[PDB]
Amino acid sequence: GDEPEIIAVRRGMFGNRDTGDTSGYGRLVRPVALPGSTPRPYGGYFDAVMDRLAEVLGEERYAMSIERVVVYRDQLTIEVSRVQLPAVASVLRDDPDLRFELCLGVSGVHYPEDTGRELHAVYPLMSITHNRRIQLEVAAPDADPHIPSLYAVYPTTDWHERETYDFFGIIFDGHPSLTRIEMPDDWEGHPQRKDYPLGGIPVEYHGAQIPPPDQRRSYS
Amino acid sequence: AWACPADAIYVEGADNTADERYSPGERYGRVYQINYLRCIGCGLCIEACPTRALTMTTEYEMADDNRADLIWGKDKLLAPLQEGMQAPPHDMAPGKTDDDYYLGNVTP
Amino acid sequence: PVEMVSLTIDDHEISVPKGTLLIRAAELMGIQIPRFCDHPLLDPVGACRQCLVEVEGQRKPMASCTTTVMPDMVVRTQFTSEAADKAQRGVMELLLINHPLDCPICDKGGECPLQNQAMSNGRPETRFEDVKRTFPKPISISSQVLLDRERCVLCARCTRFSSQIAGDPFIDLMERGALQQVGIGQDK
Amino acid sequence: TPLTPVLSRFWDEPEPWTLETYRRHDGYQGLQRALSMGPDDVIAFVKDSGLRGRGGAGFPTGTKWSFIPQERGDQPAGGPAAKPHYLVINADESEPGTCKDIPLLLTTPHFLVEGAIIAAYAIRARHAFIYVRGEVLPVLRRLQAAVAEAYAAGYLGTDIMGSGFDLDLIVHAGAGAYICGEETALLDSLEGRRGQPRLRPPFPAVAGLYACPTVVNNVESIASVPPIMVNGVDWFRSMGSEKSPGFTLYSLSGHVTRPGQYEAPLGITLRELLEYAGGVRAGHQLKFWTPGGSSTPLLTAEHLDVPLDYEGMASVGSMLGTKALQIFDETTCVVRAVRRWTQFYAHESCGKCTPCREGTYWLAQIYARLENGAGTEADIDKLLDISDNIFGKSFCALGDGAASPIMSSIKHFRDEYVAHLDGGCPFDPHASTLMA
Amino acid sequence: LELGQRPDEAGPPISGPATYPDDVTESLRADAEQIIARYPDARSALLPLLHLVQAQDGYLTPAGIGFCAAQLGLTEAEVTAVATFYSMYRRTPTGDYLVGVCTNTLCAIMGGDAILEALEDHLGVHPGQTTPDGRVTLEHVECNAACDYAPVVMVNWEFYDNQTPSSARDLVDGLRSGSPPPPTRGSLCTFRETARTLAGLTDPNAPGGAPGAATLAGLRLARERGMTAPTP
Ligand SMILES: Cc1cc2nc3c(=O)[nH]c(=O)nc-3n(C[C@H](O)[C@H](O)[C@H](O)COP(=O)(O)O)c2cc1C
Ligand code: SF4
Ligand code: SF4
Ligand code: SF4
Ligand code: SF4
Ligand code: FES
Numbered sequence A: 001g002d003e004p005e006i007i008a009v010r011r012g013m014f015g016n017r018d019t020g021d022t023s024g025y026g027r028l029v030r031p032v033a034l035p036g037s038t039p040r041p042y043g044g045y046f047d048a049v050m051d052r053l054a055e056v057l058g059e060e061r062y063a064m065s066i067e068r069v070v071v072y073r074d075q076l077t078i079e080v081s082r083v084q085l086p087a088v089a090s091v092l093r094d095d096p097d098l099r100f101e102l103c104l105g106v107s108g109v110h111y112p113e114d115t116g117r118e119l120h121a122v123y124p125l126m127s128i129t130h131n132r133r134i135q136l137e138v139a140a141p142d143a144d145p146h147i148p149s150l151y152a153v154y155p156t157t158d159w160h161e162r163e164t165y166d167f168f169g170i171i172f173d174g175h176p177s178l179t180r181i182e183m184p185d186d187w188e189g190h191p192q193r194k195d196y197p198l199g200g201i202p203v204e205y206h207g208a209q210i211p212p213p214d215q216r217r218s219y220s
Numbered sequence B: 001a002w003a004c005p006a007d008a009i010y011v012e013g014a015d016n017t018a019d020e021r022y023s024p025g026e027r028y029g030r031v032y033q034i035n036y037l038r039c040i041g042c043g044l045c046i047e048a049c050p051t052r053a054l055t056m057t058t059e060y061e062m063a064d065d066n067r068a069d070l071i072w073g074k075d076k077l078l079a080p081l082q083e084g085m086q087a088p089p090h091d092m093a094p095g096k097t098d099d100d101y102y103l104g105n106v107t108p
Numbered sequence C: 001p002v003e004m005v006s007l008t009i010d011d012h013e014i015s016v017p018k019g020t021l022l023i024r025a026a027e028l029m030g031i032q033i034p035r036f037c038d039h040p041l042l043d044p045v046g047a048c049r050q051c052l053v054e055v056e057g058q059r060k061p062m063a064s065c066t067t068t069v070m071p072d073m074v075v076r077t078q079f080t081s082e083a084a085d086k087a088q089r090g091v092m093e094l095l096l097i098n099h100p101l102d103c104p105i106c107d108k109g110g111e112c113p114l115q116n117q118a119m120s121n122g123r124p125e126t127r128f129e130d131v132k133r134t135f136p137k138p139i140s141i142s143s144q145v146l147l148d149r150e151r152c153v154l155c156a157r158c159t160r161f162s163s164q165i166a167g168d169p170f171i172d173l174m175e176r177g178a179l180q181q182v183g184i185g186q187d188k
Numbered sequence D: 001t002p003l004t005p006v007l008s009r010f011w012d013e014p015e016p017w018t019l020e021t022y023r024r025h026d027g028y029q030g031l032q033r034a035l036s037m038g039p040d041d042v043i044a045f046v047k048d049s050g051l052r053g054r055g056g057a058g059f060p061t062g063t064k065w066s067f068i069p070q071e072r073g074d075q076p077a078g079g080p081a082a083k084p085h086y087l088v089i090n091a092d093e094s095e096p097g098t099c100k101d102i103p104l105l106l107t108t109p110h111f112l113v114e115g116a117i118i119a120a121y122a123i124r125a126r127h128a129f130i131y132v133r134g135e136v137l138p139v140l141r142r143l144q145a146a147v148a149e150a151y152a153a154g155y156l157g158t159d160i161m162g163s164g165f166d167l168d169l170i171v172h173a174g175a176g177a178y179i180c181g182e183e184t185a186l187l188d189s190l191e192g193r194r195g196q197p198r199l200r201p202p203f204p205a206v207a208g209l210y211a212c213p214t215v216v217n218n219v220e221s222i223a224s225v226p227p228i229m230v231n232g233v234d235w236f237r238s239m240g241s242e243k244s245p246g247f248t249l250y251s252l253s254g255h256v257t258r259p260g261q262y263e264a265p266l267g268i269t270l271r272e273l274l275e276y277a278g279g280v281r282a283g284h285q286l287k288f289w290t291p292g293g294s295s296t297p298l299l300t301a302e303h304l305d306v307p308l309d310y311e312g313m314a315s316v317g318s319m320l321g322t323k324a325l326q327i328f329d330e331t332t333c334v335v336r337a338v339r340r341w342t343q344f345y346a347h348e349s350c351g352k353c354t355p356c357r358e359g360t361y362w363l364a365q366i367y368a369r370l371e372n373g374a375g376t377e378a379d380i381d382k383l384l385d386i387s388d389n390i391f392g393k394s395f396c397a398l399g400d401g402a403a404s405p406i407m408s409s410i411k412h413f414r415d416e417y418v419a420h421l422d423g424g425c426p427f428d429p430h431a432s433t434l435m436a
Numbered sequence E: 001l002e003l004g005q006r007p008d009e010a011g012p013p014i015s016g017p018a019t020y021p022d023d024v025t026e027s028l029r030a031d032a033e034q035i036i037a038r039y040p041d042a043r044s045a046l047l048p049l050l051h052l053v054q055a056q057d058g059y060l061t062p063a064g065i066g067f068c069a070a071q072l073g074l075t076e077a078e079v080t081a082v083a084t085f086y087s088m089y090r091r092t093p094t095g096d097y098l099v100g101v102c103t104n105t106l107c108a109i110m111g112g113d114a115i116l117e118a119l120e121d122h123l124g125v126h127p128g129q130t131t132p133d134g135r136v137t138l139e140h141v142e143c144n145a146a147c148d149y150a151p152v153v154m155v156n157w158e159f160y161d162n163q164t165p166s167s168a169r170d171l172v173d174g175l176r177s178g179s180p181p182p183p184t185r186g187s188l189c190t191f192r193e194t195a196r197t198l199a200g201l202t203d204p205n206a207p208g209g210a211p212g213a214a215t216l217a218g219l220r221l222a223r224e225r226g227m228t229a230p231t232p
């Protein structure tokens, strides 16, 4: 794809998920789109980093692996295609010009409205040698939440792949042991998924109680 | 209560009927409870309050053996009645209105 | 077959059924034009003047809530026209000068289109150092409905509903000028 | 240019309003000429006449009449019948300064009656209405008497002069509302509703009175018709410019000796009119003036010799309006005059708009603070920005008319506005009271 | 309950008698049928009807609003909305003579403000109020299309041109004490009679209405200088 990545479609003015407190304002339809591919002249060293990545990777392989490049707020995010993640990770880590020796972790985020790409894993990579920073974004469907584990390339991803599996169910296949790290192994569900309820209890008060914030109204 | 991140405040408003007025304007806080077992002392409540009705004193001693006893109602939270103050159920100051109270033009 | 007309809002082209109002087209496209008197289910009235947008070939800003789409119209809202933004913000200012400082006690607080649209399309601080219009509040127009005329923006949505949708015009815009106010007849 | 008494011609006679006197001066001959012509022929005759709206819009009346959709020889089916056509004469004259309609109706109402009959025949309107403001009760009585005389004389009703044309003319006495003088507010008041302007489109030409095709014309515009039906088109075109031909009433009022109604060709400069009037009040000079009513931008001595026609006033940046020509001399405080006009507009706004309603309220308060000495340097910039936010944004032209005095007075007298900031109005009001 | 506007609000809300007696309603029904007969749409008669009832009483009352609503099949709310919109529909007991000093910019600064102040000090009555005698109701009116006739003053909508504070004081004294001075450019009659006239139920033939000096000024100048129309 080439259009910006719509993650949610909000209907109605005032950011109201429900029908609307006032009649007549619920007809606005605004898709919430995360930024799409950036025009080629990336700012700063991002342009050099992508030039080197496209040089080390073959043109065919580069096209197959890099789904998108997003330069947002002077930060570079390579939407990498799944499956190819280990290859590009190895290239980034090992290549002298890229040399992103320090992978800082793996963060899971869930986009239940993003069809075919509900689960995203974010790999913040830093190159101390060149003092550079990038992020890799890998998308997996909710129905097939598998992603190639970067354990061979970045051992630090262990306990980050485990944590993101625990909180989102992303199956980092190839991981030495993808067991729950935060939740009990007996736990049911993956808490940080949006569909997973907050699980709070009403706050008690003399003569009343306040339900958890997830049950009550909101205007996100 | 809106701004409290811990839902530690429960407030319910009621009309300031002329027969029984507790605050200037047409609304007052009839029921006001702070669940101090949920309060985190963040202070967002006092930042939120548009009337300076809610402040945070330097008093801190608080503890009890019962969960319920730490749900402090309006009676415990209200500041003590000082000299020159009358009982809340009374009409506004003569020749004054809500705007005068908020502008600070009211005296005992 | 429904006839599709096409037009550009801001700089994005879109095709909508003929007879569509500019505000509706903007809604479908995702542009949030501030509006008070507009209502999709009420016949447009163009009263509040909040929904003004710049349309090429027109000296005046046009109320998008009353403007029918045209097959080659070029429309630029406050997002892409300084004139439209200035007009909308001036209208919001004029809308707020007489408004009461009642948000803490107003029932509509937190769910008030005026609050949200003043945040999104209004100035940050007042210039109105003068005296505000005032009415006795709240007066009862029925056993169920209280009316606080000071907060009224005279959008006529209540009256327009009670006339068009429900054939019960027992409330109407009384008086004239700054004194205009929704009201029941005398006691009926 | 010289004065051209045409409508004013009969005045100074004994009882000029009577139908006898009107007939004594070719009265209703123009109506006979019209009825000898075809309706579309009458419309074309008026279009060639170049007559333009005298109510302030300045729109060509001939084209306005032509916009009415008559069945021009085409009868696709016998039903549904075409909606009735209505001719509404805007006898409302409430714009400040404008006092031309009322003297005309009071003295020679049969001019307007004949013009209305001719116009109704032109647009084939079976019913016509004279909407006259209620605050001119003498004019109401005169107009009702004239209509009754026309009915008795056979000029109204059915088969006018055996021509087969039928017309019933109703004199509607509107209540007090300046805004009702505006199209679609005149119609709303006629329909027994609040006199608030309608949303356009649809226009009155297709969705006017009772949601039927309608024509709204100022009494001056209509009354000028009989003078041109006789004397031909070329006679009318012989006066004024090519783009603004004809004669018009100018309501010299204010600090001018011998104020009154001067009937002169369009384009006569204010200098000539003042010379005819004897100039400004003796011992004083021209400080400012309104070419049209208060709705039009103020003008000063610099424009004293600009032709009083639509083109010239547009060139100066003002509008010809209703030829109110309000005059004010040194003794007047522009801030005071503009404050009173702003108070008038606030009192006259129907309230539908947010711009007009709220902005006029705010401007009235600001001007009250200026005159009282509570003003501030920021008040002038406010006034300007508020007027900008009113002008062009309001629903009808009343908002623009309210803004116009403020903007023009600021542009011409920012010095006086600043001077008011010291301690309020420095001018002594008594100096401007005509020594009353 | 206490529905609707509070009685003490600005621009006094419609108030007074709630209903008319049977005879009053019968006479009003006759007059209203006569009025409605002359319009293609019944509601078009609402403004005259409001005048008609405002003639029955001295001002608009809930009784009159109800009568008009019943006649035109409207709700009292619609009739009230129409009524409160127009200024001539006074909302308080109006004296036999409505003296309105035109205080618009022109007439104001040309004397009108002075006239109004003088009348307020002479009668004591503030604008919009009525004299204790109930004969004069002082008010300030916007431009009345008599600008050339400076400091114009209306008496039941009859012109009094070129007034001055002394002249206006004399006029109001005459109105209050009896014999009313004749209008400069009209024929004076009681407020109720003018209200009936506005409804169109009064004989139009009335005396007065002479052109006056200002209306003639242009024609007189044309005579003096021989200026005339170009002729065919
Ligand atoms: C606020 C306002 C008030 C008006 N008042 C009058 C009026 O009193 N008399 C009049 O003839 N036109 C008045 N007009 C102009 C009307 O729109 C009029 O119907 C239109 O200009 C056509 O006039 P015409 O016959 O000269 O072409 C007013 C316009 C506005 C915006
Ligand atoms: S300090 Fe106040 S705002 Fe913060 S959690 Fe406690 S009650 Fe809520
Ligand atoms: S209606 Fe007025 S007072 Fe109430 S929430 Fe909205 S802006 Fe605040
Ligand atoms: S009361 Fe009626 S006119 Fe006023 S804001 Fe509410 S809906 Fe609009
Ligand atoms: S601009 Fe003024 S007079 Fe015209 S519709 Fe708006 S509020 Fe009414
Ligand atoms: S919403 Fe369009 S003018 Fe009010």
Ligand code: FES
Binding pocket: D096, D097, D098, D099, E102, E103, E104, E105, E106, E107, E108, E142, E143, E144, E145, E146, E147, E152
């Ligand atoms: S200003 Fe008084 S009649 Fe016009």
Ligand SMILES: [Zn+2]
Binding pocket: D333, D334, D335, D336, D371, D420, D424, D425, D426, D427
């Ligand atoms: Zn001054």
